[PDB]
Amino acid sequence: PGCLPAYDALAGQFIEASSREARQAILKQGQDGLSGVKETDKKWASQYLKIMGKILDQGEDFPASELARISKLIENKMSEGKKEELQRSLNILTAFRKKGAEKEEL
């Protein structure tokens, strides 16, 4: 178990990043990290990385307006017995309702 606050960190750092290239390094962080993301879990990780690509297509609001929701996820602390499988989907749904949004359980 272990939801990925790294999505919120990714998103946050991506803002802080001065150059579009430093922002590309935050995109690379996500992609490099995939090597250590747990078996079965590389799918949650693939989602965040596609939005991180779409920042360069659009702008740095995309994750942050979703991160405003991530607070609410943290605000309602979870039980790692079974809220995990929900909350893990929620991490993506919260910072990124792009693809994982086939779940209207937020």
PDB file of C-alpha atoms in Angstrom:
ATOM      1  CA  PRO A   1       0.000   0.000   0.000  1.00  0.00           C
ATOM      2  CA  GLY A   2       0.976   3.654  -0.465  1.00  0.00           C
ATOM      3  CA  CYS A   3      -0.885   6.248  -2.554  1.00  0.00           C
ATOM      4  CA  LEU A   4       1.449   8.537  -4.593  1.00  0.00           C
ATOM      5  CA  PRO A   5       1.692  12.089  -3.131  1.00  0.00           C
ATOM      6  CA  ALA A   6       4.483  12.275  -5.749  1.00  0.00           C
ATOM      7  CA  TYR A   7       1.669  13.323  -8.195  1.00  0.00           C
ATOM      8  CA  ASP A   8       0.947  16.382  -6.091  1.00  0.00           C
ATOM      9  CA  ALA A   9       4.759  16.926  -5.751  1.00  0.00           C
ATOM     10  CA  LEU A  10       5.173  16.524  -9.572  1.00  0.00           C
ATOM     11  CA  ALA A  11       2.424  19.003 -10.202  1.00  0.00           C
ATOM     12  CA  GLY A  12       3.782  21.493  -7.575  1.00  0.00           C
ATOM     13  CA  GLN A  13       7.436  21.258  -8.712  1.00  0.00           C
ATOM     14  CA  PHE A  14       6.295  21.638 -12.333  1.00  0.00           C
ATOM     15  CA  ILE A  15       4.892  25.076 -11.390  1.00  0.00           C
ATOM     16  CA  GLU A  16       8.087  26.114  -9.496  1.00  0.00           C
ATOM     17  CA  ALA A  17      10.198  25.084 -12.486  1.00  0.00           C
ATOM     18  CA  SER A  18      11.593  28.194 -14.196  1.00  0.00           C
ATOM     19  CA  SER A  19      12.442  26.856 -17.672  1.00  0.00           C
ATOM     20  CA  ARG A  20      10.289  24.712 -19.951  1.00  0.00           C
ATOM     21  CA  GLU A  21      13.346  22.359 -19.908  1.00  0.00           C
ATOM     22  CA  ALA A  22      13.377  22.132 -16.109  1.00  0.00           C
ATOM     23  CA  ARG A  23       9.654  21.323 -16.578  1.00  0.00           C
ATOM     24  CA  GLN A  24      10.762  18.578 -19.060  1.00  0.00           C
ATOM     25  CA  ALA A  25      13.016  17.219 -16.273  1.00  0.00           C
ATOM     26  CA  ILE A  26       9.901  16.970 -14.005  1.00  0.00           C
ATOM     27  CA  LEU A  27       8.254  15.085 -16.910  1.00  0.00           C
ATOM     28  CA  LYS A  28      11.380  12.855 -17.005  1.00  0.00           C
ATOM     29  CA  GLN A  29      11.149  12.392 -13.187  1.00  0.00           C
ATOM     30  CA  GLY A  30       7.798  10.814 -13.683  1.00  0.00           C
ATOM     31  CA  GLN A  31       9.076   8.595 -16.532  1.00  0.00           C
ATOM     32  CA  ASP A  32      12.274   7.558 -14.692  1.00  0.00           C
ATOM     33  CA  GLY A  33      10.242   6.768 -11.545  1.00  0.00           C
ATOM     34  CA  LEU A  34       8.186   4.243 -13.601  1.00  0.00           C
ATOM     35  CA  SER A  35      11.084   1.819 -13.251  1.00  0.00           C
ATOM     36  CA  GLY A  36      10.515   1.649  -9.473  1.00  0.00           C
ATOM     37  CA  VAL A  37       6.704   2.024  -9.472  1.00  0.00           C
ATOM     38  CA  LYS A  38       5.321  -1.318  -8.214  1.00  0.00           C
ATOM     39  CA  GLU A  39       4.088  -4.053 -10.578  1.00  0.00           C
ATOM     40  CA  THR A  40       0.360  -3.484 -11.328  1.00  0.00           C
ATOM     41  CA  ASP A  41       0.865   0.186 -10.263  1.00  0.00           C
ATOM     42  CA  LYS A  42       2.740   1.398 -13.395  1.00  0.00           C
ATOM     43  CA  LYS A  43      -0.800   2.208 -14.799  1.00  0.00           C
ATOM     44  CA  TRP A  44      -1.595   4.836 -12.167  1.00  0.00           C
ATOM     45  CA  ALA A  45       1.851   6.286 -12.888  1.00  0.00           C
ATOM     46  CA  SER A  46       1.277   6.350 -16.666  1.00  0.00           C
ATOM     47  CA  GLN A  47      -1.754   8.608 -16.166  1.00  0.00           C
ATOM     48  CA  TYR A  48       0.051  11.470 -14.347  1.00  0.00           C
ATOM     49  CA  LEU A  49       2.787  11.421 -16.992  1.00  0.00           C
ATOM     50  CA  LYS A  50       0.395  12.075 -19.842  1.00  0.00           C
ATOM     51  CA  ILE A  51      -0.965  15.235 -18.136  1.00  0.00           C
ATOM     52  CA  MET A  52       2.640  16.262 -17.387  1.00  0.00           C
ATOM     53  CA  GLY A  53       3.123  16.024 -21.190  1.00  0.00           C
ATOM     54  CA  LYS A  54      -0.118  18.067 -21.805  1.00  0.00           C
ATOM     55  CA  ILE A  55       1.231  20.910 -19.625  1.00  0.00           C
ATOM     56  CA  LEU A  56       3.616  21.706 -22.500  1.00  0.00           C
ATOM     57  CA  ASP A  57       0.610  21.620 -24.885  1.00  0.00           C
ATOM     58  CA  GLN A  58      -1.462  23.914 -22.594  1.00  0.00           C
ATOM     59  CA  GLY A  59      -0.163  25.483 -19.335  1.00  0.00           C
ATOM     60  CA  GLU A  60       0.734  24.874 -15.650  1.00  0.00           C
ATOM     61  CA  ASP A  61      -2.843  25.400 -14.340  1.00  0.00           C
ATOM     62  CA  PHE A  62      -3.912  21.932 -15.486  1.00  0.00           C
ATOM     63  CA  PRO A  63      -2.476  19.962 -12.518  1.00  0.00           C
ATOM     64  CA  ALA A  64      -2.790  22.822  -9.922  1.00  0.00           C
ATOM     65  CA  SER A  65      -6.576  23.304 -10.408  1.00  0.00           C
ATOM     66  CA  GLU A  66      -6.791  19.551  -9.798  1.00  0.00           C
ATOM     67  CA  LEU A  67      -4.267  19.769  -6.803  1.00  0.00           C
ATOM     68  CA  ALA A  68      -6.779  22.145  -5.163  1.00  0.00           C
ATOM     69  CA  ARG A  69      -8.877  18.922  -4.962  1.00  0.00           C
ATOM     70  CA  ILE A  70      -5.869  16.869  -3.603  1.00  0.00           C
ATOM     71  CA  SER A  71      -6.085  18.903  -0.374  1.00  0.00           C
ATOM     72  CA  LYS A  72      -9.639  17.492   0.119  1.00  0.00           C
ATOM     73  CA  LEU A  73      -8.202  13.981  -0.410  1.00  0.00           C
ATOM     74  CA  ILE A  74      -5.667  14.576   2.384  1.00  0.00           C
ATOM     75  CA  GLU A  75      -8.325  16.381   4.537  1.00  0.00           C
ATOM     76  CA  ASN A  76     -10.283  13.078   4.606  1.00  0.00           C
ATOM     77  CA  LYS A  77      -7.605  10.736   5.942  1.00  0.00           C
ATOM     78  CA  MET A  78      -7.957   7.107   4.842  1.00  0.00           C
ATOM     79  CA  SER A  79      -7.770   3.571   6.218  1.00  0.00           C
ATOM     80  CA  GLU A  80      -5.087   1.610   4.390  1.00  0.00           C
ATOM     81  CA  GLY A  81      -7.100  -1.652   4.635  1.00  0.00           C
ATOM     82  CA  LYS A  82      -9.545  -0.868   1.779  1.00  0.00           C
ATOM     83  CA  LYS A  83      -9.651   2.891   1.138  1.00  0.00           C
ATOM     84  CA  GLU A  84      -6.337   2.269  -0.732  1.00  0.00           C
ATOM     85  CA  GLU A  85      -7.899   0.832  -3.890  1.00  0.00           C
ATOM     86  CA  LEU A  86     -10.373   3.769  -3.904  1.00  0.00           C
ATOM     87  CA  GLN A  87      -7.909   6.552  -2.840  1.00  0.00           C
ATOM     88  CA  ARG A  88      -5.280   5.349  -5.375  1.00  0.00           C
ATOM     89  CA  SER A  89      -7.821   5.837  -8.118  1.00  0.00           C
ATOM     90  CA  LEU A  90      -8.761   9.079  -6.332  1.00  0.00           C
ATOM     91  CA  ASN A  91      -5.116  10.395  -6.471  1.00  0.00           C
ATOM     92  CA  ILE A  92      -5.360  10.293 -10.247  1.00  0.00           C
ATOM     93  CA  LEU A  93      -9.044  11.407 -10.350  1.00  0.00           C
ATOM     94  CA  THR A  94      -8.139  14.337  -8.120  1.00  0.00           C
ATOM     95  CA  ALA A  95      -4.918  15.693  -9.707  1.00  0.00           C
ATOM     96  CA  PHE A  96      -5.958  14.422 -13.197  1.00  0.00           C
ATOM     97  CA  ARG A  97      -9.702  13.564 -14.173  1.00  0.00           C
ATOM     98  CA  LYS A  98      -8.555  12.932 -17.737  1.00  0.00           C
ATOM     99  CA  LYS A  99      -8.623   9.129 -18.343  1.00  0.00           C
ATOM    100  CA  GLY A 100      -9.175   7.564 -14.899  1.00  0.00           C
ATOM    101  CA  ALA A 101     -12.485   9.528 -14.987  1.00  0.00           C
ATOM    102  CA  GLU A 102     -14.386   6.370 -15.990  1.00  0.00           C
ATOM    103  CA  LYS A 103     -14.983   6.120 -12.182  1.00  0.00           C
ATOM    104  CA  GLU A 104     -17.589   8.743 -11.131  1.00  0.00           C
ATOM    105  CA  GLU A 105     -16.739   7.734  -7.503  1.00  0.00           C
ATOM    106  CA  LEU A 106     -14.679  10.750  -6.288  1.00  0.00           C
TER     107      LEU A 106
END
